[model samples]
Target chain A: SALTQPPSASGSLGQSVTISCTGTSSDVGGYNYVSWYQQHAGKAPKVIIYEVNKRPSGVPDRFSGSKSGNTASLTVSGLQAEDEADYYCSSYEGSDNFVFGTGTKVTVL
Target chain B: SALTQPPSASGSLGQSVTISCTGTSSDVGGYNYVSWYQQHAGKAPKVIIYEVNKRPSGVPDRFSGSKSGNTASLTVSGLQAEDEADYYCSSYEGSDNFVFGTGTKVTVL
Candidate 1:
């Protein structure tokens, strides 16, 4: 299955931005289980969204996730400077395996 | 919950090395949901092991993982130059988000 994402995306403060992740039907588009992570500069990557759109405690509601067919999107509303980071999407590729997206860098201007 | 990991670890070529990931019983030790990832420079992280020690297809037998109490470890045997990269451990904290270890840089000398 294919796991791909854009290299970079940007948005202005108080605005919104969305990062897209697409995979083959054998994976993302066919599964209800998808995850997303955020790795801020020099910090350990953390899971912000899991099982598609569930947010963990301590995560801001401003950050949201959605999936439709082969594509999944992570949207950041009311973007803040702290929201600038690298975002990666993940999905179970079945057969006790998983794959991660190439990753996308979100720049908040 | 966040897991703790050594900032860096090293081993000679063909040698063996182990990176430790420590968490709480409320997380790692309590469940068999620990996972490990390998990430090369400027690349996306890949799942090397899941469900504590189960290796995915396509992963080499040189990699092994285990857990005792609240600590988990990923061992690399017959280390190769290509094994040099960042290693991270993750644990699913029930009702919470999955937490990742601080990450360790493995250097094959």
Candidate 2:
């Protein structure tokens, strides 16, 4: 079965939405870390989620992540033109493996 | 914001290693929870390590990652000619930032 974040049922590009991942501690990991990434057309995916709330060295602060219960979320605040990319949420499972969520496309509004 | 530096290396056809540097305390934090990935010529990259030092299921134990202070490192213990691929590191930062190294290209000698 596939786990999915609710899609753009009513959102436009340039407008940011939050994608949520809900799974047992076994899948998302009680000790594992979670992160989000964005990949544009013909480009490498950039890190969006880092250390739960901390951004990487050069990442913009507009992107944010949070966790509650068994779920994690990435939020892109004040979206920009360049922010138009595919977003992904990833986590390190305690089992020595990594898992990625189905991507969310940030389309032009 | 998050920052990352690029790394490059060359090795005999039977040996290879690629390194990426995460800067400051942005992405991935000082949490010892970064990951490295291996990308072959055409396919999407595969996860080699998770949570700084854990390898995914079925991933070779030869691939390893370690974190010290704000610096994190990924090492492929044994080099295989097949390891001739690109490697990337990712970490979570404050404000939902995920810092990624510019990516390192590994060449086979």
Candidate 3:
């Protein structure tokens, strides 16, 4: 099943906002294989977090991820105009299957 | 950076077609890579293939994936109207990071 996420999330500049990605035990809750990605319109997504809380080499510390039960979350801190974009979560299911979140848009105010 | 893919592809009913994703040696050509996703206009993308060529549970056999050198390919056989949608290829960039392809629109004619 696809993960669920709010359609939009917002935060004032320098503030923080959190987005939740909900899934079933067969996916997000099944293993420690969740990843978070940020995307600009018309562009491919860039992975921000992989293996739940692990960030990529060049990803900023402002992005963090956590998981509790069947829900995973991504928090963007110190929101900047550059941070305004669509974010998605993906989790691995057994047999190499993976599912993606509905996606959330972040707006910086 | 994102992988390269053609903007669109079309095939007649019951025919077969393939979409290619081109990346660098750091991604597709390297080990531990390549997945494919399908998306509709307002829905989350669905993984059709993972770990290069493995199909997800419930995904049709008509959809398949492969990789060679610096490129990955997705093939759709016996095309059906439902096969028309946007597809993307993705690969792990190491260090827990991943990137997506430019995306291709499939038109089952």
Candidate 4:
């Protein structure tokens, strides 16, 4: 099944915004890896968090990921204008497959 | 750690085509986890291949993947109209997380 997410999220400058992703137990809770990606319009998606809450080097700690039950969440602290983009959560469903969230556009107001 | 890919590719109907993805020693060549994705207009990107050549269920056999050294490739055989979309490659870059290819637009002409 396709992952679920809200269509949009918003936050004021310097504030924080959180995007949520929901998946089946067969995909999210059953697996150890849940990733989050950020994509600007007309660009490829970039991985900001992988293996649940781990952030990549050079990525700001302000961006974080967490999981509970079959749901995953990405919280962007200290939101900025440049943070305006689409965010997606992905889960490894085994057998070389993955499912992605519906996608959430974060608008830094 | 940016992965590289051709900007566009094309093939005639019922023909075959390939999209190339190149990474550096710090990423693809150093790791065994490489994935390919397909994204249609207004749709979320879907994983077609992971770990180089493994196909997920529901993905057609016509879609194939391979990797050599720092380069990985996705080949689509018996190209159909519905196969026209943007293609991207991703690699796990250790603590740097995952990096994605520039993306290739495949046209079934």
Candidate 2 residue runs with Cα over 4 Å from true position? A1-109, B13-18
Residue-level lDDT tens digits of model 2 in B42-97: 99999888787787899865565555335455545346777788888888665665
The lDDT values for all models are 0.78, 0.60, 0.78, 0.77
lDDT of 4 by residue, B4-100 (tens): 7767767668755566676777887788798999999999999999987778999877676655446666767678998899999999989969999
Task: Write the residue-wise lDDT of candidate 3 on B17-70 in tens digits.
Answer: 566676777998786478999998788899998988788899876675655446
> Mind giving the per-residue lDDT tens digits that candidate 4 earns over A1-109?
6787667666667755556666777887778688999999899989999998888998987776665456566777667999999998999998999988878888887
Score candidate 2 by lDDT. Answer: 0.60
- Against the true structure, what is each candidate's TM-score? 0.50, 0.46, 0.50, 0.50
Q: Please list all clashing residue pairs in model 4, or write none if there are none.
A: none
Q: Considering every candidate listed, which one attains the maximal lDDT? A: 3
**lDDT winner, 3 or 4:** 3
For chain B alone, what TM-score does every candidate structure achieve against the true structure? 0.96, 0.82, 0.95, 0.95
lDDT by residue for model 1 over B40-82, one digit each (tens)? 9999999999988788999876676665446666767678999
lDDT of 3 at B3: 83
DockQ of 1: 0.02
Better of 1 and 2 by TM-score: 1
lDDT of candidate 3 over A1-109, digit per residue (tens):
5797767666667655566676778988799899999999999889999998899999987676666556676777667999999999999988968999889888888
List, residue by residue over A17-57, the lDDT tens digit for candidate 2.
Answer: 34455445665536347777878879877786666566898
Poorest stretch of ten by lDDT in candidate 4 chain B: B64-73
